[PDB]
């Protein structure tokens, strides 16, 4: 029924900023997870509620692939129960997450001589993101009680911040591409299954 288009997700030329993280729905296709897990291409490949070696034996109603770019020392925030600027304000996994977090160093593709500042993360927000919530607004953040009126100033901040990805950065401040696979099984016929 056609192979699932994982390459469309994992080898995309352009990845999203985490604040505007990208979601692709995967449905009606044969998924080979082992070829991802056993590729030796990833520095993180961990699953919650499923084993990585058993993914090829599982059927799901739908799969969601969320993808974005963060720095390496923030990869640890892409896990249930984690807190920090990324989990709080950018991309939040639920406590009962079933799926996989997959990450790899993308310095060879996302670093520029002179610095790559294209990737942004939300630095300020009034409250924490709910699980799988996406906030792409770009309003001036009111830190105090006086309204901002579209204007920076005292207690009034632009809420997005560039990562400063210089190629000479330490590995903790290097860019990592991240894909979060979410597996849903509902009481519908399974559309995404493993091979054989």
């Amino acid at each position, epitope marked *: 029924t056609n192979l699932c288009p994982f390459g469309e997700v994992f080898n995309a030329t352009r990845f999203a900023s985490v604040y505007a993280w990208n979601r692709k729905r995967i449905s009606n296709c044969v998924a080979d997870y082992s070829v991802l897990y056993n590729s030796a291409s990833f520095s993180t490949f961990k699953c919650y509620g499923v084993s990585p070696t058993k993914l090829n034996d599982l059927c799901f109603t739908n799969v969601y692939a969320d993808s974005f770019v963060i720095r390496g020392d923030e990869v640890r925030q892409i896990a249930p129960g984690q807190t920090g600027k990324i989990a709080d304000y950018n991309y939040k996994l639920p406590d009962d997450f079933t799926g996989c977090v997959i990450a790899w160093n993308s310095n060879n593709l996302d670093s520029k001589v002179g*610095g790559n500042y294209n990737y942004l993360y939300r630095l300020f927000r009034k409250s924490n993101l709910k699980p799988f919530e996406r906030d792409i607004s770009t309003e001036i953040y009111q830190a105090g009680s006086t309204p901002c009126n579209g204007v920076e100033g005292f207690n009034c901040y632009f809420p997005l911040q560039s990562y400063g990805f210089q190629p000479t950065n330490g590995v903790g401040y290097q860019p990592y591409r991240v894909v979060v696979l979410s597996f849903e099984l509902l009481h519908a016929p399974a559309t995404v299954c493993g091979p054989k």
Partner: nanobody
Amino acid sequence: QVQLVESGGGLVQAGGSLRLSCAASGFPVYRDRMAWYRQAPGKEREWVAAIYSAGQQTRYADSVKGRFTISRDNAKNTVYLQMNSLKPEDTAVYYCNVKDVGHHYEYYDYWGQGTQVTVSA
């Protein structure tokens, strides 16, 4: 490594125009946010204008709305502030500004040396 150099400015009569430049070295001008501030004699440094890579591209303080326009040139790694219909209240030292994040999540404010802008009544 990160450095901002303001140029432009000088003396102008009320109603005249000026273009300030901010040459950036160590980082690309295409980034989250680049800002212009100004500090008048005896006053607090205040935000004037900013250009953003996401959302509304430009924002301006109320007192300069409709009279200033900010822009960027990537080939020259520069940000410009075009100032029209200048008024004596616009007299100040002008600074460009960026806010960077470091390895240990420090937030550093980078300023240039400033350029003097004088508008005579």
